[PDB]
RNA sequence: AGGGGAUCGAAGAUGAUCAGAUACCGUCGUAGUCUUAACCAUAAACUAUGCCGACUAGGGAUCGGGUGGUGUUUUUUUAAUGACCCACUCGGCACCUUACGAGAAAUCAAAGUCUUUGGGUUCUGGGGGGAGUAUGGUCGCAAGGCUGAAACUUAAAGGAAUU
């Protein structure tokens, strides 16, 4: 019977078992639990302004050798300390 | 080791394939005959080819061996293909004119061919 | 065999199969008539009696209980009914 | 235990066809199975079935010609409407030209094409092709 | 991956048996799993019977033989060369 | 297959096995075609006339090819009492 | 020069067998790539890709190239062949020969109006090679071959104008899904559509009637 | 049908039962062999010699159906039928593979032993499984001298006979040669017995 | 690490955490 | 918590070997190993394969019961019974050969009858770590059992086979 109920009057069992089994999905848990509104630094936003506290420099991970020239910026709304990344070459001079 | 190479092995068998009587049962007499028969560029090579050939010439005298095919092998077995036993060819013989059978075998006889000599055991 | 008659089995095939595996379900038992010595007093006895049958006239064992077919007494005669 | 009689009968028929056998012993017995065999006979997917009668359910022996490919049951018996016939035939049949979805309806047991012409619909039994 | 149909050794339908002890290293092994070799060797060594016979009271006729059953663990049986590994095709051979 | 005007589309209408009706595939390199010579009165075969029997690869692999062939031979009259329907 | 060895090669060279249909109908084994090209002169080649295969040895690898080549004309015939070789061009040359030797025909059909010419497949046919499955559902006119570009090209050389496709498994393995698709278009004639139900006399094998031009 | 002159004559019946051809094997018996007729108390299963004759003449018609008498191939790996195949390959045409049969005579098209037959006649299918296996790939009917216990895989025509005996194997080959020669049209009347001794196909111990 | 030794280590660590727990609660 | 406590023997005490050895090896040795009464609810507790039902390639051996064969042997040569031989049947622990069929393969008479997808039903899993951890409940004298996350981190782990 493929391990699933197959009666014409057995729909609650499939509906319930679907409800628990979809919780294993990463997207299903991420959306319904609403962790983006609690633990995400951006708080469910595409952009976030902040204040440049200091200029930062980090080293690359294995098989690589560079300093990424990052920056530590405190978001305004949340007030959390968040590291950012200045993308283009020679762009730290613009920021301060 | 004295293991002969396949080159002298195959050529020697080919020599006896078409030349039974030419290779005599002695080494020296047919050693030069092998040179006269096959194009051999080395005196050493024809010496070993005749040595194996003479040794094979001795073994065939004792009896047939594998891979002989000497144009005379069929001569005996084409003569020895007509054994044809004169009378007792396992038919109407080996008994007192009656075939020894069993009870179940008799029921097979009474099926369609009951007109036969039977001897139920 | 791909082409065989499951609808008209031969006598040998039906006699070999179990009573529950034949073309039609039927018993394999039978009823026997046993007579005590001297008096006739015919009585019917099952093949698997499961008990010790006695003719009400004479207190004599006519068969002994057995897991398979019932074993009739030596001083008895049996006939198919 | 034994839940459906037609499911076992059709499975045995399919197994016999896969084994190159021209016969199969159907032994859950039913009237739906008999009617399911009659509609198969109407399109020539089987030969002749004769029902052995004991004082129990019964047995059926159907002679199979080498024309049937697959016969199955659709359990549970879904409440297919008259507009869902095309959807079922588009998921249980290889091609639209042949193949017959055998469904039970208030006018009896028959196939999908006859249901369209009679303009009636019922429960879906299975499929034959 | 699976190696043998009988996983450990000769046990289908029991589930548990009383274990035995190896005679070499005293390893605890299941009775079925243990590899048993029977020793039928004579009480005397190879030859030397003729020396015994000359110094034998009564018309000899004794020649006793000691009988013993030995249980070997997998590690000891392989190490003692009693049981040797085989190819996959030879593994199925009994 | 045919279209509306009636001319026969689809090519090489395939053969079928003589024991269990099944299309013999083009790459089914296990099906042989049995040919049986026809005798006439004098007991000599007549070249050119054959009794064509076809057996699919599946039947041959099962080992029922011999059983099927005698059934067809007995049905067509080639053999007399080598098969029994009521086995 | 060909100097064929097989009986079929002698027959086709002499001009006795003039159609590939007779060999398909009689299931006559053939291993001679002259036979296939002579009977099917419009026969084309299309290689998907070349994937090297490496075997490790005591000192370095033994890189060899594996090529997949499709052989088939767009009117009912198609063939596939895979061969490994040290040189990529040699693998392609050998792949053409094998694909020629493995030419299979196609049973086209319709989604259905019984009106024009066979465009789609007659029934639903699938083939499995390893873990990949390829389903070929018939499609209405004008739908086209909706599938991966590799199998779309293979089906376009098979003569199919429109079809539906479903795949399950690691479809990224091109060789497996090509063979699985090849089996799918190989089982089309296997299906017994009710039109092919009438009994027909068994044709006598061409070799039996042409045994005079065989051997010696 | 047949002119009814091919029925088992008492002379042929006497010969067949003299070589113990009817004597089959013990309880080992495949379900694909219904030719067995009762069973002796010892355990030997008796083969109906009548069914062998109709199967023998059916094979003869099949062999005679071959137009050119070289596509017929007789193969034998057992030493008890080597001479029978050789004599059968010299009296009724056909090519012999008596002795070792190399793996590839039927499939490898560049070998020195490559032949393209239309009919293969093996002696022991169990001992000639390689020949049957290759014959399956190239669409060739197989005729085998099978017993009750011998496998019937890829065997289209069976000849019920005893394979564990020189007498039975030689007799079946002798009878098969007799029937096929009469069908070809070289053995004149079908009533006169063949002028060669049946022991010619037999194999001597040396 | 082995499963047994890892489980024993985390069990001893759990025992230590619970012993610290019993001091406050 | 009592009885019992001979061998083996978590701890521990020594003898060594070893650069180090409170490990492997040797000699002692407590708890324990046995049992009574009450708890603990765990295992590679595995056939790593849930239960019920139907169908499908053959072959032999074996366990329990039954049937038949003037079958063999046995006591009083010969009745019974019993023990064996042959044939058959039902339920079993299983096994040998093939692979229609399935599977990624190793392999499987099911792990087959699943893209030709549907016999009935229960439980579990959704990349690898964190983690069976933290907390909250619940059971237990305790050791521990059941339910059971998140933050964070990574582009790999993992399975079967080839050289």
Curated annotation (Swiss-Prot), chain E:
One of its GO terms (cellular component) is 90S preribosome. Component of the ribosome, a large ribonucleoprotein complex responsible for the synthesis of proteins in the cell. The small ribosomal subunit (SSU) binds messenger RNAs (mRNAs) and translates the encoded message by selecting cognate aminoacyl-transfer RNA (tRNA) molecules. The large subunit (LSU) contains the ribosomal catalytic site termed the peptidyl transferase center (PTC), which catalyzes the formation of peptide bonds, thereby polymerizing the amino acids delivered by tRNAs into a polypeptide chain. It comes from Saccharomyces cerevisiae (strain ATCC 204508 / S288c). The gene is RPS26A. Residues 1-19 are annotated as: Disordered. GO terms for molecular function: mRNA binding; structural constituent of ribosome. Present with 16300 molecules/cell in log phase SD medium. There are 2 genes for eS26 in yeast. Component of the small ribosomal subunit (SSU). Mature yeast ribosomes consist of a small (40S) and a large (60S) subunit. The 40S small subunit contains 1 molecule of ribosomal RNA (18S rRNA) and 33 different proteins (encoded by 57 genes). The large 60S subunit contains 3 rRNA molecules (25S, 5.8S and 5S rRNA) and 46 different proteins (encoded by 81 genes). eS26 interacts with eS1 forming part of the mRNA exit tunnel. eS26 interacts with TSR2. Keywords: Cytoplasm, Ribonucleoprotein, Ribosomal protein.
UniProtKB/Swiss-Prot annotation, chain F:
Keywords: Acetylation, Cytoplasm, Ribonucleoprotein, Ribosomal protein, rRNA processing. N-terminally acetylated by acetyltransferase NatB. GO terms for biological process: endonucleolytic cleavage in ITS1 to separate SSU-rRNA from 5.8S rRNA and LSU-rRNA from tricistronic rRNA transcript (SSU-rRNA, 5.8S rRNA, LSU-rRNA); endonucleolytic cleavage to generate mature 3'-end of SSU-rRNA from (SSU-rRNA, 5.8S rRNA, LSU-rRNA); translation. Pfam families: Ribosomal_S21e. It is found in: Cytoplasm. The keyword Cytoplasm applies. InterPro entries: Ribosomal_eS21, Ribosomal_eS21_CS, Ribosomal_eS21_sf. Disruption phenotype: Reduction in growth rate, a decrease in free 40S subunits, an increase in the amount of free 60S subunits and a decrease in polysome size. Its main location: cytoplasm. One of its GO terms (cellular component) is cytosol. The modification N-acetylmethionine is found at residue 1. One of its GO terms (molecular function) is structural constituent of ribosome. Component of the ribosome, a large ribonucleoprotein complex responsible for the synthesis of proteins in the cell. The small ribosomal subunit (SSU) binds messenger RNAs (mRNAs) and translates the encoded message by selecting cognate aminoacyl-transfer RNA (tRNA) molecules. The large subunit (LSU) contains the ribosomal catalytic site termed the peptidyl transferase center (PTC), which catalyzes the formation of peptide bonds, thereby polymerizing the amino acids delivered by tRNAs into a polypeptide chain. PANTHER family: 40S RIBOSOMAL PROTEIN S21. Belongs to the eukaryotic ribosomal protein eS21 family.
Swiss-Prot record, chain H:
The modification N-acetylserine is found at residue 1. Disruption phenotype: Reduction in growth rate, a decrease in free 40S subunits, an increase in the amount of free 60S subunits and a decrease in polysome size. Signal peptide: none annotated. Component of the small ribosomal subunit (SSU). Mature yeast ribosomes consist of a small (40S) and a large (60S) subunit. The 40S small subunit contains 1 molecule of ribosomal RNA (18S rRNA) and 33 different proteins (encoded by 57 genes). The large 60S subunit contains 3 rRNA molecules (25S, 5.8S and 5S rRNA) and 46 different proteins (encoded by 81 genes). It comes from Saccharomyces cerevisiae (strain ATCC 204508 / S288c) (Baker's yeast). The chain holds residues 2 to 207 of 252 of the full protein. Belongs to the universal ribosomal protein uS2 family. GO terms for molecular function: structural constituent of ribosome. Its main location: cytoplasm. Present with 93700 molecules/cell in log phase SD medium. There are 2 genes for uS2 in yeast. N-terminally acetylated by acetyltransferase NatA. It is found in: Cytoplasm. This is Small ribosomal subunit protein uS2A. GO terms for biological process: cytoplasmic translation; endonucleolytic cleavage in ITS1 to separate SSU-rRNA from 5.8S rRNA and LSU-rRNA from tricistronic rRNA transcript (SSU-rRNA, 5.8S rRNA, LSU-rRNA); endonucleolytic cleavage to generate mature 3'-end of SSU-rRNA from (SSU-rRNA, 5.8S rRNA, LSU-rRNA); ribosomal small subunit assembly; ribosomal subunit export from nucleus. One of its GO terms (cellular component) is cytoplasmic stress granule. Transmembrane segments: none annotated.
Swiss-Prot record, chain I:
InterPro entries: Ribosomal_eS32. Its main location: cytoplasm. Keywords: Cytoplasm, Ribonucleoprotein, Ribosomal protein. GO terms for cellular component: cytosol; cytosolic large ribosomal subunit. The keyword Ribosomal protein applies. Residues 1-25 are annotated as: Disordered. Pfam families: Ribosomal_L41. Present with 11900 molecules/cell in log phase SD medium. There are 2 genes for this protein in yeast. This is Small ribosomal subunit protein eS32A. It comes from Saccharomyces cerevisiae (strain ATCC 204508 / S288c) (Baker's yeast). The gene is RPL41A.
